[PDB]
């Protein structure tokens, strides 16, 4: 069932959100926000800069002070507020999915059934953890009583990408708030709108002021201000590996703030000759084409054993030739645009390198349409390991298919990258499934599927795809700071 | 009981340790190693540089390969090797304590009864964790079987300081090896000797070659090579906050390697009027003077309620006037030298700032002796919060004593620093002990004691005193990399 | 704020609840249900017996089968259903609190503000755990992949007491359902009504049929049928220690079903001479008098240091002389009746033993009123350790106050019982608070408070006060059954 | 390599062990101890009875008192003593393996390479846990500080079986001592000798007196005394399900002591048509024949898909026809005797029922030899589900092989028992391996192997095969008692 908004979407929230009130930019400047499917301007939004990040950090710092409502309320009540926020997003699901689709160039069907559902589910997951964050009592040597407090870290700067604006907003603020932190959020310049609507719901739910502050603006300005701020305790960033290196450097340069990074990938699939071929073709297809290829986990190197390689390529090409391009709000449309011009150019450039460097073009290979940043879905076969399309993250609807004959060699090829976000193994052999997944240097390894991500799982990269993990039990560790308290006593007993 | 070595100490191990064999420096260069209590040269050691770190990373990488002995042996056997290494250090305790004291300027009594005991105990603690590192099975949404592997990260560069060369060597390699990593260790330029002897014992114990590689040399050369290396997965550094910022920046600049930092402090004590005064005087005294003040946790700001301030100052001064300076090997000597000239100059300079800026000099305040980097134990009273001796880490035998009258104000003063390693609270009030320890922004808070550190406790800093934790259950997390494995199944059941 | 039901309470749900439908008793027999404050009959309820427990076990067994909706739905959805049930109880809070007060003889103010709030909060706590129940991956010796599943146990029989019918219903079904079990609940013969209303809400919330089955009836009949049933996997019982022994024996005799027991107590308080005297008097007063003394944790032995004993006794007596007895529905009433005649007789008998055995009667000591099972609030001083009122659980509004002079001796006296549910320590001394709480053989020890119980804490007895724990992280273990799965593989890697 | 004792074994330790000293029985009576391979008497041992269990409980109680050496020593030192005990057993491995083989009728090769190795490894595993047993700090509702202590329970009675006397002794005392308990051990009447030698090593290692007390004697006398004792806090029993029911009943009848039970089984294997047939034949063969079939996990129902059934039966029969019966000390001997006459008679009786009830006798079926309790290794094919040999635990070298054609049906057959200790699944299908292991009601499920047990894994039964788990992280829970400590504070902060 796909319900829709019956009235025209109205844009209301366009300002900076600090202390639960709406602020104009200190400068007074605004910046435009566009629809990627028509290239038209949707509205203007206050452009946050350093001076505005500064106001937001002071509010988050004040809300984090010992004795404050956010520090003294029951953990169970932090969880209650998060579950109420999820309820409010459920109530506004139609308008949120519409705004996300319109602003993000995201198929409305997916925005409604996947993004919004994942936002609600992840918030509810995080809410349940709030009063279950616990320290230890420890049998230290000597006559002492030792316990630990897993405290919130403090003020957390959180820089959100444009490919999944709502899901990634919730993946950031959910755990941070559950653990008792306060946050300064910087949504992507391309997609500030849905985060500002959620800010309106954070007010409605009753979060104390300054617990969540949202500062739209640009990366090199507001994002850099966060990463270099001397009173931000931790920065979490999701985006390119190139910016991730800059975030980590600025943290070292300023105040040694803690850093979590969720970065790009060049994630491989290994399809053994004994695999369920149709199952592997479909999971690897969606694994690389999902959201116009704009997933960091994109299955952008697909290695197929020689004896099924040609059959795999044909079936992949047939699947890719079935899309309907156009406005992601129209029912039946199955591929929307890329997010903006910068990404669009890099995709087309990489596609050209595939042609020149000798990859076999099976379908697609060019732009589409009169308006919008549309790229034809493209499949390359006979890709080799030193081609650009095999080394660089494309972030577009561009599939690479490679042949292998030796299992030892293909694992080394799969691992021969600086990336390491995810991988897939397709086989019917129990031993191969366990040993290959163990040997891949990747944060998530899927067996006989791809792209399966849920709130209960930790998620993050090996190597240059990331530092740290998000979600699951394990992800919640990086939103606490562990304090050891050791008390002298006359005599301990076990 | 204080047994001693009956024969003259002989220095044997002076070379670089890679793949369980002894290497000359690629350059062929050596550097001198001195005794800080006499300023004489003890021996020469091969000077590792980038080319030597390079050989060590390739050995650690090869030892980490899937299928290798270190990757395939039982976790219980990793633990067995660590317990055997502890046995071997116990066997060589006399010579190790002598070498540590001679090279490190460290009171032999402490070297034998505390450093060596802590090395043995921490190794035995870490050994017990090896086959108890576990992942999860997770009830993910949908028809999937999801488990996690807490794998070793890989090759870990570990830069060891000179104030506790053996303890910090073991605090680094213990957890790293227990979790299955391989390491490239860089001991301090001042104190390479005891780490090279332990390397000889790692060979004897039977660790596979390349699991532990030790490259003596200088910070700006070998240490920088580690921090910027493109095939080191994680760097752990203990030392100054200034170098810590450089380590973190170089990690961001190169390969986004994971970073753990244990840095300096300006740790405060708060002594309430109802405290056991003698107990507070003695714990705070040793808290700041231990190992000639060369502890990152040094209790270098001591705040005393006005009505007991003068009594606290007198009793502190009497305790400080009781030391016997000289060679740390002679029995009855109770204060050895500072480690080297650089540290010695910074201490004397800061002591001079105390005189000029108006602190009340109660005892000490100058150098001592014909030879050795000796500083008189010094006490300053009437210290105020913007003096240099109240803001900068001294790392010398220099005690600061301050008065307070308001508890709200003194907590803000205690927290008004970029440091945050530790703190102490001295009181008989149950509520004050809990609420004050909760409000201090410090990684370890001691109640009615100070400086109590043990293998069972996590240990690390808030703010610019550190990133991450070492030891305890929680410290072992930062030597694993979490992989999620998600398997498609026909139907799951709870 | 104390809102009330504006309309007369109507009783609707009076039948056995199996497979989400209402059943008459197999026999066709019903039993009466009374109001303890007027001794009048409120209604009749179907009397479940063995044949009815049998129907309920078969339904719970079928609902637990592999492939069933309850076994295959996402853990997150089990949690969702529990949070919806909490929402429904919130909606029906007025009628539930009224029915609980009317049926249970429970002060309406407490029923509304404490019992109902605790029901809602505990359900919400348990809901959060559902998709956070996890097993392990384990580095077993040899070439194997080993993981564990923390499965639900299966069909759990749950026998609920009459002193807190709703809270204890939720403390049982919350964790059991969160972990994926199915249940057969047997509410107290005295108080079946609120559990049957909740059953109506379990239907409304959408739990699959047979996941929760509720069989009202008598202990020796339906309760014994559960404890001896050959296809019930686990029994949880809260009630007297005498019945607890019978439950455990019948489990051994039949099918070795798992057993959790939450039983009575004779819990002690130790009030040191340095205690906040008013704080100790008030917490110990409510600790023994709460809900007409009908708490298993009742603070029924209060030991006071000699020098403050007389002052403690006077202040206690003044507090006890302030109650207003009567119908627990009338505002301003502060003490309702005992639950029934059996309990009423045992209370009066024990009160008489206090008079005869030489206790000093300070106030109360007899019955009250024309109707209802009312007991005057009673205080005994000069109680000695071999009196009946110091050894046997009274479960009535009867306070015992004892003198001590030696701390070693009073701890031995506190521990000299077969019970061990809880205890309290009142002191301003940090060391005494830690060492005394460590030395008491009791499941919960309160320091400078009493009776503080919350969903985040494990709760249960030492010794003959109980087996196992309920709630908290730790309580959830006893609603899982751990399965180890060990898979042969060609070669493992860490 | 199989080294042997060069000198005749001398029996020295034959008395009751209490408070680290050797006691004669209160009665003065002794009982004989036999060799099962020759039926000759090896020595006499003091016969412990109730009066002797009484002396042992008082010693264990005194050793558990608050302030005692065992209660106050560092947890790390409890671990140290356990690692030293493992060292001492390693030193005495030859004599211990000889005594175990001689007393137990156990193949010396297995006694040396498996039993003794498992004793040493399990002790070392348990030692590592000692200072890693931790409670929690908990964010309770309201202004309170709440922590938990995972205390030792207290005095634990431990009844050890005769099939693995040393391994099961260590599986019991290892975790109990690691957690800080004191124990009263009752080795099997048939095999007291190796436990008394270990007691001598517990003295040598330096355990405080009364921490371990060992009372040889008979089940209905000393074992019943333990199970009914009013001052034993917990009983752990391994043995038959029939005695397990009596242990659990006596616990309920006396003092509600905690109970852990490791009982028998009728564990099934399911061999799918796609299995590695040779691998399944060998693992299932050893799974049922190990230690003359005297394992509770014996794979005593083997279900094989029809199309490979005949091939499976032939290959099994060939493997069973390869044993050499005789004295388990002689090299090359591969099957020793059953433990005693009672077990020997039950085995032969059940074998006769197989003949009469219509099972196809493939080999064996009778006794062997002039002396010793020897049974020919026996294989039955065409076994059906209501035969005695398919329902009752045989505990002898008797293999049952069954045919199945329907997977749904064979899982129901596998689960159609009151037992539930373990099971095996043999297949090459990933989905079948996961779904079948999930659906089996068994505590350990092996995939493509059988009988793989190690210290890092929890181990125990579903249903009437057991209550609770031993070893692993999870097994250590049942040797602690959780105490919640809740402290009133003026204001909490997260
Ligand atoms: C949020 S909760 O669900 O955890 N729980 C909180 C506690 N509850 C109260 O109503 C309550 C309130 N005030 C008190 C004041 C003094 C006192 F001694 C007790 C109380 C109790 C109380 C405490 C323990 C019990 C048990 C026993 N035996 C475990 C049944 C029963 C009632 C029920 C709701
Ligand atoms: C390291 S350990 O301490 O964990 N443990 C490893 C297993 N042990 C073996 O000797 C062993 C060896 N080989 C086998 C081969 C096939 C087989 F079916 C069983 C075995 C067993 C084995 C397995 C289970 C049991 C129990 C039962 N019932 C739990 C008592 C007893 C013996 C003892 C030492
Ligand atoms: Cl911790
Ligand atoms: Cl995990
Ligand atoms: Cl587990
Ligand atoms: Cl706990």
């Amino acid at each position: 069932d796909l319900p829709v908004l019956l009235t025209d979407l109205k844009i209301q929230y366009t300002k900076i959100f600090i202390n639960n009130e709406w602020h104009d930019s200190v400068s007074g400047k605004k910046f435009p926000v566009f629809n990627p499917a028509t290239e038209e301007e949707l509205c203007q939004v206050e452009e946050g800069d350093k001076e505005d990040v500064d106001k937001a950090v002071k509010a988050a710092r004040q809300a984090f002070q010992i004795g404050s409502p956010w520090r003294t309320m029951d953990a169970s009540e932090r969880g209650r507020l998060l579950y109420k926020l999820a309820d409010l997003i459920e109530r506004d699901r139609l308008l949120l999915a519409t705004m996300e689709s319109m602003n993000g160039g995201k198929l409305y069907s997916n925005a409604y059934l996947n993004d919004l559902a994942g936002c609600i589910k992840t918030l509810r997951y995080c809410a349940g953890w709030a009063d279950k964050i616990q320290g230890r009592t420890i049998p230290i040597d000597g006559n002492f009583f030792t316990y630990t407090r897993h405290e919130p870290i403090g003020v957390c700067g959180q820089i959100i990408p444009w490919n999944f604006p709502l899901v990634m907003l919730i993946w950031k603020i959910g755990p941070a708030l559950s653990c008792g932190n306060t946050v300064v959020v910087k949504p992507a310049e391309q997609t500030p709108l849905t985060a500002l609507h959620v800010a309106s719901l954070i007010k409605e739910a009753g979060f104390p002021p300054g617990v969540v502050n949202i500062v739209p603006g640009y990366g090199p300005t507001a994002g850099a201000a966060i990463s270099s701020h001397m009173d931000i305790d931790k920065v979490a960033f999701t985006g390119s590996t190139e910016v991730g290196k800059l975030i980590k450097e600025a943290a070292g340069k300023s105040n040694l703030k803690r850093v979590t990074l969720e970065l790009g990938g060049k994630s491989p699939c290994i399809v053994l000759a004994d695999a369920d071929l149709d199952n592997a073709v479909e999971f690897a297809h969606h694994g690389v084409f999902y959201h116009q290829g704009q997933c960091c986990i994109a299955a952008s190197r697909i290695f197929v054993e020689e004896s099924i390689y040609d059959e795999f390529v044909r079936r992949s090409v047939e699947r890719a030739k079935k899309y309907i391009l156009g406005n992601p709000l129209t029912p039946g449309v199955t591929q929307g645009p890329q997010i903006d011009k910068e990404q669009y150019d890099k995709i087309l450039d990489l596609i050209e390198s595939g042609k020149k460097e000798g990859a076999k073009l099976e379908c697609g290979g060019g732009p589409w349409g009169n308006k919008g940043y549309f790229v034809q879905p493209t499949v390359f076969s006979n890709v080799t390991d030193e081609m650009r399309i095999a080394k660089e993250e494309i972030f577009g609807p561009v599939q690479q298919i490679m042949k292998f004959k030796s299992l030892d060699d293909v694992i080394k090829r799969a691992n021969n990258t600086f990336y390491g976000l995810s991988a897939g193994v397709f086989t019917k052999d129990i031993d191969k499934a366990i040993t290959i997944s163990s040997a891949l240097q990747a944060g998530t390894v899927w067996v006989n599927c791809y792209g399966v991500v849920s709130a209960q799982c930790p998620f993050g990269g090996f190597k240059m795809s990331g530092n740290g993990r998000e979600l699951g039990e394990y992800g919640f560790h990086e939103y606490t700071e562990v304090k050891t308290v050791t008390v002298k006593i006359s005599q301990k007993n076990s």
Side-chain angles (χ1 to χ4, degrees), chain A:
Chain A
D1 258 355
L2 203 35
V4 292
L5 206 63
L6 309 178
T7 66
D8 285 80
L9 182 101
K10 172 250 213 202
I11 300 171
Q12 180 176 5
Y13 305 107
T14 61
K15 293 192 181 198
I16 294 154
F17 185 80
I18 296 165
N19 273 325
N20 288 2
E21 52 203 355
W22 300 104
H23 292 242
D24 301 321
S25 64
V26 165
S27 78
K29 308 179 32 208
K30 312 180 174 63
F31 66 103
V33 175
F34 293 92
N35 183 334
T38 68
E39 299 172 46
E40 76 205 326
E41 182 185 310
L42 299 165
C43 68
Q44 310 256 312
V45 174
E46 309 294 320
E47 193 198 332
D49 215 321
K50 175 75 214 270
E51 298 81 6
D52 311 278
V53 169
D54 273 343
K55 295 163 59 176
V57 172
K58 291 177 169 186
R61 176 61 60 198
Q62 182 62 244
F64 193 69
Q65 285 314 301
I66 289 277
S68 79
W70 192 239
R71 286 307 290 286
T72 63
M73 77 171 54
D74 296 328
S76 63
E77 190 68 17
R78 295 201 310 273
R80 183 66 185 145
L81 283 162
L82 288 167
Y83 213 99
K84 185 32 71 185
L85 175 56
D87 286 347
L88 293 181
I89 289 167
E90 205 176 49
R91 184 198 65 199
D92 292 358
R93 186 179 180 170
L94 292 173
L95 84 85
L96 277 176
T98 305
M99 184 181 301
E100 190 87 314
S101 168
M102 188 175 316
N103 193 179
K106 177 186 298 273
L107 293 166
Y108 173 79
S109 178
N110 301 68
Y112 183 87
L113 299 162
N114 297 355
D115 297 69
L116 259 294
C119 275
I120 296 158
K121 281 176 175 279
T122 294
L123 265 178
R124 288 175 172 160
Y125 179 80
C126 292
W129 267 119
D131 59 0
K132 296 166 195 72
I133 305 307
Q134 304 175 322
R136 298 300 185 257
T137 59
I138 301 174
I140 189 187
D141 280 358
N143 281 316
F144 305 92
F145 168 41
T146 290
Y147 60 97
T148 60
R149 284 163 48 85
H150 292 211
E151 307 189 346
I153 304 169
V155 181
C156 299
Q158 300 184 312
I159 299 161
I160 317 299
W162 50 257
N163 62 347
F164 296 86
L166 278 167
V167 174
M168 292 289 98
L169 175 66
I170 267 59
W171 277 34
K172 260 59 170 184
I173 70 170
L177 296 176
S178 182
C179 290
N181 299 278
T182 63
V183 300
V184 172
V185 176
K186 205 292 272 186
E189 37 192 293
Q190 299 87 347
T191 60
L193 295 186
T194 50
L196 297 176
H197 184 92
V198 171
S200 95
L201 303 180
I202 284 168
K203 180 162 183 170
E204 187 177 350
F207 284 86
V211 174
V212 173
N213 313 271
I214 303 190
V215 179
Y218 291 84
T221 50
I226 295 176
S227 69
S228 57
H229 205 284
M230 291 299 294
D231 202 42
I232 292 184
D233 296 291
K234 177 235 177 83
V235 51
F237 171 83
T238 297
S240 73
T241 289
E242 180 187 15
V243 181
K245 300 176 75 177
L246 300 176
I247 301 269
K248 190 132 153 151
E249 175 188 354
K253 255 188 203 167
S254 42
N255 73 333
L256 283 167
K257 57 176 59 70
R258 291 92 175 104
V259 304
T260 285
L261 301 169
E262 297 269 352
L263 309 167
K266 196 75 201 183
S267 303
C269 283
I270 296 175
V271 186
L272 273 48
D274 77 337
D276 187 320
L277 184 55
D278 279 353
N279 180 70
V281 167
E282 181 84 341
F283 268 113
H285 168 87
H286 290 291
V288 75
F289 281 105
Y290 197 78
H291 193 25
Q292 290 93 245
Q294 305 179 123
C295 294
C296 296
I297 59 153
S300 55
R301 293 181 298 148
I302 299 167
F303 298 92
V304 183
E305 202 276 343
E306 302 206 324
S307 68
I308 56 163
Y309 171 75
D310 293 325
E311 192 54 33
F312 191 101
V313 172
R314 153 174 87 89
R315 301 194 191 191
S316 298
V317 166
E318 278 165 61
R319 183 58 189 91
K321 287 174 82 171
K322 284 185 174 178
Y323 284 101
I324 305 167
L325 272 57
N327 195 292
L329 285 164
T330 312
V333 172
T334 52
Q335 187 190 310
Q338 317 305 130
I339 189 63
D340 70 0
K341 179 204 202 290
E342 203 195 82
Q343 298 303 127
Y344 166 91
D345 291 335
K346 303 193 250 133
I347 292 155
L348 296 189
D349 177 75
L350 281 163
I351 284 178
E352 284 309 290
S353 82
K355 296 169 170 169
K356 284 163 51 92
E357 292 189 325
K360 177 167 171 171
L361 175 71
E362 302 278 359
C363 62
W368 181 96
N370 274 168
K371 271 299 163 231
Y373 299 106
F374 291 98
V375 175
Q376 293 171 48
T378 301
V379 179
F380 282 108
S381 76
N382 298 336
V383 182
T384 57
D385 289 342
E386 310 298 311
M387 295 176 165
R388 284 187 73 210
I389 56 173
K391 292 191 290 171
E392 306 175 26
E393 174 176 63
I394 304 179
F395 255 42
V398 189
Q399 177 173 231
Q400 285 66 232
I401 306 180
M402 302 87 144
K403 151 168 58 193
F404 82 91
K405 197 289 189 201
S406 149
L407 184 55
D408 291 334
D409 188 58
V410 76
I411 296 173
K412 283 203 249 134
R413 288 167 70 196
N415 284 341
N416 193 15
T417 172
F418 278 107
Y419 289 118
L421 191 53
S422 58
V425 185
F426 294 82
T427 184
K428 289 183 204 297
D429 188 310
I430 294 165
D431 194 65
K432 298 267 187 304
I434 293 165
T435 64
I436 300 175
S437 61
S438 298
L440 289 172
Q441 298 166 358
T444 300
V445 183
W446 292 288
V447 178
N448 293 328
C449 61
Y450 199 91
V452 181
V453 164
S454 186
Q456 296 79 21
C457 308
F459 178 93
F462 282 36
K463 300 204 293 206
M464 305 203 61
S465 306
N467 289 172
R469 296 291 178 263
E470 288 186 356
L471 298 197
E473 170 183 40
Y474 201 85
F476 274 65
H477 291 318
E478 284 155 51
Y479 276 106
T480 61
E481 188 79 39
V482 173
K483 165 183 290 165
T484 303
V485 183
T486 292
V487 180
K488 175 182 142 70
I489 61 171
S490 49
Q491 165 204 87
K492 60 157 176 211
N493 283 266
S494 52

